[PDB]
Amino acid sequence: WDVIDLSRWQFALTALYHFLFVPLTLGLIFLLAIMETIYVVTGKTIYRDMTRFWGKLFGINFALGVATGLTMEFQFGTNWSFYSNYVGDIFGAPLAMEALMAFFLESTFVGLFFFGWQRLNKYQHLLVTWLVAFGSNLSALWILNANGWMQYPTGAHFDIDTLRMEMTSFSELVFNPVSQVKFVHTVMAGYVTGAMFIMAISAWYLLRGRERNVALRSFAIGSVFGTLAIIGTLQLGDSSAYEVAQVQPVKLAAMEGENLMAETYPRLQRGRMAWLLMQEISQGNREPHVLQAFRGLEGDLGYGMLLSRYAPDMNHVTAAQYQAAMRGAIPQVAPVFWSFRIMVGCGSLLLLVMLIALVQTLRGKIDQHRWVLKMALWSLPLPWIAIEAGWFMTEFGRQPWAIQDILPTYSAHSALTTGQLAFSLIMIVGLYTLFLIAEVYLMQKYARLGPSAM
């Protein structure tokens, strides 16, 4: 296997593993915030006990989430050193701001959430839970701002002296339309995930005739929150579809039921010219006509860097090499098409489930029909399926680009050997297998034990 492909699969697996646990964190923490808010408003202790039980499950998920995030933070440096160098001037900023605003907030106050039940008074603990919720969602905001910049690079310019993309306007990064809709859509999906989680576990209780009161209230909270969440998810999904329609023809072609190939050949030509000029610039040339030509062609340096892979001789690029790069500019449309479809279809199933659950909730007949509870129970995997589909579409549909039309994935890689990647893959996969088995086991065991064991 090419070491670049091992690195791609490593980031693939580790991001996917991390986002097995993130969506649940994102939605469940606001569900805990709601439970604790209801407890504060009403003084009804059952909602405090619900906060503690569902938060115990939250902690089980949150620990693996933290560890998997740790893998992701430094993977950019370890496996994508050229990516880090080339775009860090823009891309490292949202990651840093995530650390500064969001990670500190959520990680600092999750400890207060779990261990401050007594040392904090009721209102301070409510605030702490809300701060955990907002910190995790603000982390979503900033990391998804970075990912959105990867989809739609804005407010950046190439600097000849540093041979890298440089920031031009911070505001064009912060208010990147893609990043905005990506943030809101993803966090809505996380709210759906948390709601479906508590609803499914409550339905399992109600089918066995146990934990009935906690199960009823938790099902109700999940029903209302997840109805609103799935509605917002669908609307922001349409917004995301519109934005990627504007800026990413490939993902636009995926949803269309699958031109750009042909368009990429003039861009490949201009990119070859820009690459030759950029090699000249690296060699220290500053001749005026050279820099004016480069300013005319710097919008295609990415396509030149893509061509570099299929043409060892960039001065003399044969048509066969041109066509190899032509094909390699467009990813396989079928994984993206089927990812989009699973995501959308699972969303439709989730909307139906949430609406039925909400109707039974508002009528006060949660336990009336057993089939409602069975459907809620069996719907538990759907949010994760749709979420991993959405992220597969997101991350495969920008291929071959690490940064759309700026940095090819094949050019972003570190200088590593298949031995080092084999080591990292074997260790990460084995450890993650053990961790996932342990976490699913503990989650199953403590959900099965239920609130009464608390």
């Binding site: 808010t37 905001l141 943030f183 809101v184 966090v187 209230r217 109700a220 609103l228 917002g232 508002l362």
Partner: peptide, 28 residues
């Protein structure tokens, strides 16, 4: 602008969940 919309909307979602549960809790 979507961040403001998200902030307002999550406040509204949590508020509506809280209010609906306050209303519905006696029925449960």
């Amino acid at each position: 602008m979507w961040y403001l919309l998200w902030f307002v909307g999550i406040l509204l979602m949590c508020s509506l969940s809280t209010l609906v549960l306050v209303w519905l809790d006696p029925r449960l």
